[PDB]
Design an enzyme around this catalytic site. Structure first.
Site, PDB file in Angstrom:
ATOM      1  CG  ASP A  31       0.556  -2.262 -14.730  1.00  0.00           C
ATOM      2  OD1 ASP A  31       1.605  -1.478 -14.736  1.00  0.00           O
ATOM      3  OD2 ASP A  31       0.860  -3.219 -14.057  1.00  0.00           O
ATOM      4  CB  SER A  67      17.205   5.499 -22.000  1.00  0.00           C
ATOM      5  OG  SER A  67      17.551   6.998 -21.457  1.00  0.00           O
TER       6      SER A  67
HETATM    7  N1  LIG Z   1       0.706  -3.087  -3.885  1.00  0.00           N
HETATM    8  C1  LIG Z   1      -0.583  -3.124  -4.442  1.00  0.00           C
HETATM    9  C2  LIG Z   1      -0.608  -2.379  -5.760  1.00  0.00           C
HETATM   10  C3  LIG Z   1      -1.525  -1.196  -6.123  1.00  0.00           C
HETATM   11  C4  LIG Z   1      -0.963  -0.985  -7.338  1.00  0.00           C
HETATM   12  C5  LIG Z   1      -0.196  -2.048  -7.834  1.00  0.00           C
HETATM   13  C6  LIG Z   1       0.278  -2.419  -9.175  1.00  0.00           C
HETATM   14  F1  LIG Z   1       0.147  -1.507 -10.032  1.00  0.00           F
HETATM   15  F2  LIG Z   1       1.657  -2.415  -8.972  1.00  0.00           F
HETATM   16  F3  LIG Z   1      -0.115  -3.665  -9.565  1.00  0.00           F
HETATM   17  O1  LIG Z   1      -0.069  -2.937  -6.903  1.00  0.00           O
END
Ligand SMILES: NCc1ccc(C(F)(F)F)o1
Length: 330
Positions: free
Chosen positions: A35, A199
């Site tokens: 992430d 962008s």
């Molecule tokens: N909704 C739970 C979930 C899965 C993945 C994620 C996140 F990447 F947004 F943190 O949140």
């Protein structure tokens, strides 16, 4: 050093991507959601409330000879979709695709919210935004990339997400075989802790390009592309029957539609998102109303170049002293 790991969609819609990560000694392999919009590496664990674990693989620090409790440290995080988690912290050895960091903060969940419990395929998150966002208290911790950076051949990682297919995260090198043409680099602001860039504009389908600055974040942990209401309205106006539904929570369109592409600007370069990438399928099983992959950022407070956009490109997260982002077609 370098690392290279395959990332795999969790389902047929590419709702998220998981990447195997080795934690501890002997290795415990967990599938984490990488992430670039957050900065905590947290995992389901032996400490997670039992009723909140439903099929995830857990990290058990007591079974790792290299695990050490980071005494007094706690963490608590909330994400943009309303989900959350919290717990305490260990340090341990973490490897991704052959790249190893010793002493990495591994945040052990004591509690996770319902949507994490319901996501049996996601064993935790690996944050790749800037370490200034890390939630560990009272001593903030560094991300995996920040810990690895000095050892990397080049202080970069790349995201090459697949459409309905596996892709790759590389650390420490740029695979010049993984993209076409040239990589266009663009400035980043780290002021909000994100890979935030501007962008240069957009086009809908075969339409003319609109030159306009769109500030937003490159966020591998967000599924969709969230853009200003003006831009999003211009997109969905080209799809017969498309409408914003407050009851569903965004733009929906007839599942019988052929979606137009969406182009975004990176400097003088252009990344084209095929229409198929913007289809997120029926709103409920059997429905002929389908959910759109481009949605309004109004109310979020920031524009988000999530997976829908990023998977159309080879993306370089350049963590040099002055960070930048690079985009290439592929
Ligand atoms: N909704 C739970 C979930 C899965 C993945 C994620 C996140 F990447 F947004 F943190 O949140």
């Amino acid at each position: 050093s370098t690392g290279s790991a395959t990332t795999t969609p969790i389902d047929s819609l590419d709702d998220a991507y998981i990447t195997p990560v080795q934690i501890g000694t002997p290795a415990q392999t967990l599938n984490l959601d990488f992430d670039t919009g957050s900065s905590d590496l947290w995992v389901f664990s032996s400490e997670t409330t039992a009723s909140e674990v439903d099929g995830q693989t857990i990290y058990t620090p007591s079974k790792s000879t290299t695990a050490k409790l980071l005494s007094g440290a706690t963490w608590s995080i909330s994400y943009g979709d309303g989900s959350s988690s919290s717990g305490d912290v260990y340090t341990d050895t973490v490897s991704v695709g052959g790249l190893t960091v010793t002493g990495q903060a591994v945040e052990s969940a004591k509690k996770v919210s319902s949507s994490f419990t319901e996501d049996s395929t996601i064993d935790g998150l690996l944050g790749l935004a800037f370490s200034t966002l890390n939630t560990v208290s009272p001593t903030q911790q560094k991300t995996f990339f920040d810990n690895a950076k000095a050892s990397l051949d080049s202080p970069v990682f790349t995201a090459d997400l697949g459409y309905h297919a596996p892709g790759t995260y590389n650390f420490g090198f740029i695979d010049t075989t993984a993209y076409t043409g040239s990589i266009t680099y663009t400035a980043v602001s780290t002021k909000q802790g994100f890979w935030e860039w501007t962008s240069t504009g957009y086009a809908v389908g075969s339409g003319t390009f609109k030159s306009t600055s769109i500030d937003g974040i490159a966020d591998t942990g967000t599924t969709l592309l969230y853009l200003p209401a003006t831009v999003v309205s211009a997109y969905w106006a080209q799809v017969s029957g498309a409408k914003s539904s407050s009851s569903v929570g965004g733009y929906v369109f007839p599942c019988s539609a052929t979606l137009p592409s969406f182009t975004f600007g990176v400097g003088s370069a252009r990344i084209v998102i095929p229409g198929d990438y913007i289809d997120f399928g029926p709103i409920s099983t059997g429905s002929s109303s389908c959910f759109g992959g481009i949605q309004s950022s109004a109310g979020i407070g920031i524009n988000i170049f999530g997976d829908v956009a990023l998977k159309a490109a080879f993306v370089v997260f350049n963590g040099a002293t002055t960070p930048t982002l690079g985009f290439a077609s592929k």
